[PDB]
Assembly symmetry: D3
């Protein structure tokens, strides 16, 4: 039984995130999609809203468990009995910070292996931030988000 | 009649921006210098101040039209009958975000072509943000800004 | 403005990525010269005549494209072709660094030539002629990245 | 899930950086094939037999590692080895650009193969077989970057 | 007598910063570790706290002088009779902004030479920001900070 | 402190970019050795004697510059020259990745040698000896990027 954690702010979860978590379930027995509270990022959606959106978005994937956390992600991964930490790698700018976070996590929990997955070309140029910006300007974001997420983002901005 | 839009925050417009818009007028019949309201960026100058500064800075260029907008830039480009979207490419860090914005704009308006122009070596290491920082510390920024802009930035910080 | 633009490269062979870029350029410029470098230093898989014939066939549906070979400096050719626009396809960060060096050098050589960077479809943003040739040489399927005529010529080339 | 993973490369020679990556892969995957490319185009310092023998000796303490040579496309080998995971070591930004091109090409060639990027220790994050060979050829001390058997073979190679 | 300035926010000073300033004292006769007030960065520690922490952290280095400044760093370097400006180069992302700052400083003070030093592999993936984030989540940061700094960060977050 | 610094490279040929870097180094270090690599692997346009003579002429106005050739590892030369400072010119992101690999390797080889990165004028931030030679070989104007003596020698070299 191999347990992987996929941590992030997921404010909100996008098709890019769905792509990564799906690739993770094909590789590992159990995947914990872990939503960081991230108050420093001043998130659009509350932790509870992000958890509900991700639960509904990944309900079709049987080996996905969605959980929120305010803890240090290394402690949360230890407490979830995870030995793999998944992160998606879109481009060079993300990669630089990903190395810092992975080297820090390695110092905090050496047995937790950080692995990087690459999203499809389709989602290689999107982010939660970019989708929110288009949506703040009433631009069509239906293509980039699960149905429930799209509806929730429409509601939040109305 | 080929119509290009050059969108940005232009808070404030710099010689780097003047260089790009000038290169755009040598290539296209009509260039719309489009100033985004950008409230998320908490701009130093109001949209109306940015419009007036850019109007005065580009008045020597006959085929430049300066306009402000709070709309989605793809809708604004459609509404201006533009088929070309100009962006300046200084370095690698800008380029990464430019690809995301251009792929998003392509999804929103496929017939709007994003084109990138490269500024002179002279303005390749400046930004509105950098100029404002030097100016907040009373450093000489006369070299990087049009006269009217320099005067307005002095006034704003006094 | 009746703009003449040049789109230079080795095109060894021409890919769907190059077709995407030259198609975008024809939508904004009146005349586009797709200029094929003799490129001796690189030692191309296809001869210049083969490269020109392939690009001609693959761009025949584009009325404002002219396929031409050249052996001079790409600024000297642009100058003599009366081009004022230099098309460069931009895929990612790694090439961008060399692109800025090339664009500043071209500006020194010919100030009246303006470098314009176009972005290909996400579909072709991660390929190159180099990678396509390597995959094909090693018995990989590259059909999806090439015009049909290029696919046919590449199989014939690798067979012998 | 009884996962089969492949870790391909030229391994010319195998370094402590490669050992670090293959050790991390054995901790998360049931069987790891360390696959050594014939790699003619590059013209390797060590022959394929030498490279295979060195990697075998240097990974002998890892029970779930299989050292194997291959000459086909790395996707064709992975497919025939029934591997569903492709291990790639990630050191820095420069290689990352080529890594995304390689990973998208491998996904086109074999959708059922998943590219996974592992990060080496900070200790090996700034070395390559290329840099190690260059230093050693120029009479520099590379003992710290190599398994002991590799260090012995490299001195013997450079002596003659 | 060669005088170098090592400017930064140092919020708080890390072992990465200690590594750079130590390398600077082996190269130059006198090194001024200059702490920018940086109010735009909303620093965790006041300028006076950052000065005291850095003074205590570098007291073992005889040719280090710690000073705070709210001035333009080019004017401060001129006023300190410095001809060398030290900056540490961790990775690509820092480098891009470092070039802008160095080209700006060169415009402000041409005789001030910006030099870049490379930290040890040990500190190549850390930053004040990253250390503060781990510490906000009660993660162990003793390895990345001088003793006095670690204690002060514990206190501040308690 | 009476600092000895080394500024190594192939200098094939020496450009205004190299002159800018070595001039900045003489302003902060007591003695600067401009060290020219034999560099066989690269196959230089100018011989080592030609490269040394050109750099000598182009730096003659700088009293604390010594032009010297070397064939050893650049750390072995620095050690034997009693240099404690290694000057590296930094132009852009692409070279920076290799610069960190080189600097960490040089630190392993000679801990007492400190790598210092200097920034050239914006004027020379987008050129290289490689690009200059390519332009010149292809009948482009490179006068602006070179010392006058280098410009004269380059025309003579390309003529024959
Ligand atoms: O384990 C961690 C390592 C480095 C940074 C971190 N930031 C968090 C948190 F914000 F809680 F998600 N956990 C971290
Ligand atoms: O068309 C757009 C695409 C992507 C992001 C965008 N942000 C804006 C706006 F803020 F209004 F300028 N328009 C966008
Ligand atoms: O105009 C150019 C500028 C810089 C380099 C160049 N190399 C060529 C050539 F190879 F000839 F096509 N043209 C160049
Ligand atoms: O599967 C591959 C994808 C892309 C390029 C590749 N080059 C090889 C080979 F050299 F044969 F090992 N395999 C590749
Ligand atoms: O000399 C400077 C050049 C560029 C930006 C600058 N920002 C400062 C300050 F914030 F004061 F530290 N000084 C600067
Ligand atoms: O000291 C060095 C460190 C790393 C690589 C190196 N290659 C050389 C040489 F080519 F010999 F000049 N010196 C090096």
């Amino acid at each position: 039984q191999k347990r992987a954690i996929y941590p992030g702010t997921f404010d909100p979860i996008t098709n890019g995130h769905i792509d990564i978590v799906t690739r993770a379930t094909q590789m590992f027995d159990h995947v914990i999609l872990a939503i960081a509270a991230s108050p420093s990022k001043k998130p659009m959606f509350t932790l509870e809203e992000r958890v509900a959106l991700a639960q509904q978005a990944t309900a079709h994937l049987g080996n996905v468990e969605v959980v929120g956390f305010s803890d240090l992600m290394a402690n949360f991964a230890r407490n979830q009995h995870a030995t793999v930490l998944i992160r998606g790698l879109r481009a060079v700018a993300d990669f630089e910070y990903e190395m810092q976070l992975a080297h820090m996590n390695r110092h905090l929990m050496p047995e937790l292996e950080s692995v990087f997955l690459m999203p499809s070309k389709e989602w290689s140029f999107i982010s939660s931030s970019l989708v929110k910006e288009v949506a703040r300007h009433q631009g069509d974001v239906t293509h980039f988000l699960p149905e429930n997420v799209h509806q929730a983002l429409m509601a939040k901005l109305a």
